[PDB]
Every structure is written in structure tokens, then in C-alpha cells.
Amino acid sequence: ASATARVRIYPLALAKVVKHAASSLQREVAGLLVGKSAGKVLEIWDAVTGEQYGTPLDEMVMAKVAEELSKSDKNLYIVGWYHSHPGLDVFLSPTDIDTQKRYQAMFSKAVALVVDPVDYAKTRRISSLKFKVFQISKEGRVVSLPVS
């Protein structure tokens, strides 16, 4: 359906995304996914961001993400992004589609992890996490990828 067949999100990455998203329920937070492909499987090993957590400048976002990237594993690379949409359920907005298309122009296997962390933050159970991982097909459809 799209360039990447499926995705494996390592627990430390998922933890980082969820902590960010769940710590910031008033905001549609974002960051980068760090990992590597292994054939048709895209591995998400880590996540970084230049955004603030919680209740809160491009110049600060750039510094912070550069600092995080400087500490990242040199055998890994940017494989996508995440975006939280508290209370909106899980889909790519029109804006998100544009962004994802831009990511894919940088790296054809890039993916978009969308999370709605409201229920997780209420229940404190990962099984209440609402998320999907998306890519955009050539013909412009939003495709939801298998995730382990």
C-alpha cells in the first residue's frame, strides 16, 4: 500500500513519545522518530524533540532538538515524527498529511505516529493508548501500518 510494510516501536521510544504527549495535554506536541530500516520493517528505536513538556520559540526548538540529536546513536537516523492530538482521535489532519508528504520526500520509508494520549493520561494504562502509524501512498491515501 505504501513504502514501509510495517513498523516495530521499541519500548524506550514508545515511552518517550507517550511521556511527552501525556505530559502536555493542552498542546499538540511533536518530535522526531529515530531508528533504522531492516528491509521492509521500520524500527523505531528512540524519539527526540525540541519542544517543551507540559505548560510552556523556533530558536529554542532547534537548540534542544540539536542537543538531543547530538547524543543519539550514530547507527540510527530520522525515520519519521510523532504528533499528539489530545481528544481528537487518531488520524492525520490535512496539515499532517502535508507534513508527512514532506517527510517522505526526505526519506521514503518515513512514518507519522499520531497519538491521542487523553485516555492513557486518565486511566494510566498503556492499553488505553490511542495511536496509529501512518504513511501517504503515491496516489495520496492515508495508510495505517501494522505496528508491533
> Which residues are bridge partners to 130 per DSSP?
116
CA 28, 105, 101: angle at the middle one, nearest 5? Answer: 40
Question: Which residues make up each annotated binding site for Zn(2+)?
Answer: 83, 85, 96
CB count in 10 Å sphere of residue 113: 27
CA distance 146 to 25: 26
Q: Measured between alpha carbons, how far is 104 from 22 in angstroms, rounded to an integer?
A: 27
Output the nine-digit C-alpha cell for 119. Answer: 485516555
Resolution, given in Å to one decimal, reads: 1.4
Retrieve residue 134's grid coordinates.
Answer: 501512518
Give binding residues as ranges: 83, 85, 96
Q: How far apart are CA 97 and CA 111, in angstroms?
A: 11
So where are the chain's domains? 11-128
Residue 30 has phi, psi (to 5 degrees) of -145, 160
Method: X-ray
Q: Is 81 within 8 Å of 65 (Cβ atoms)?
A: no
CATH of domain 11-128: 3.40.140.10
End-to-end CA distance of the chain: 18
* Closest among 139, 88, 147 to 112, alpha carbons compared: 147
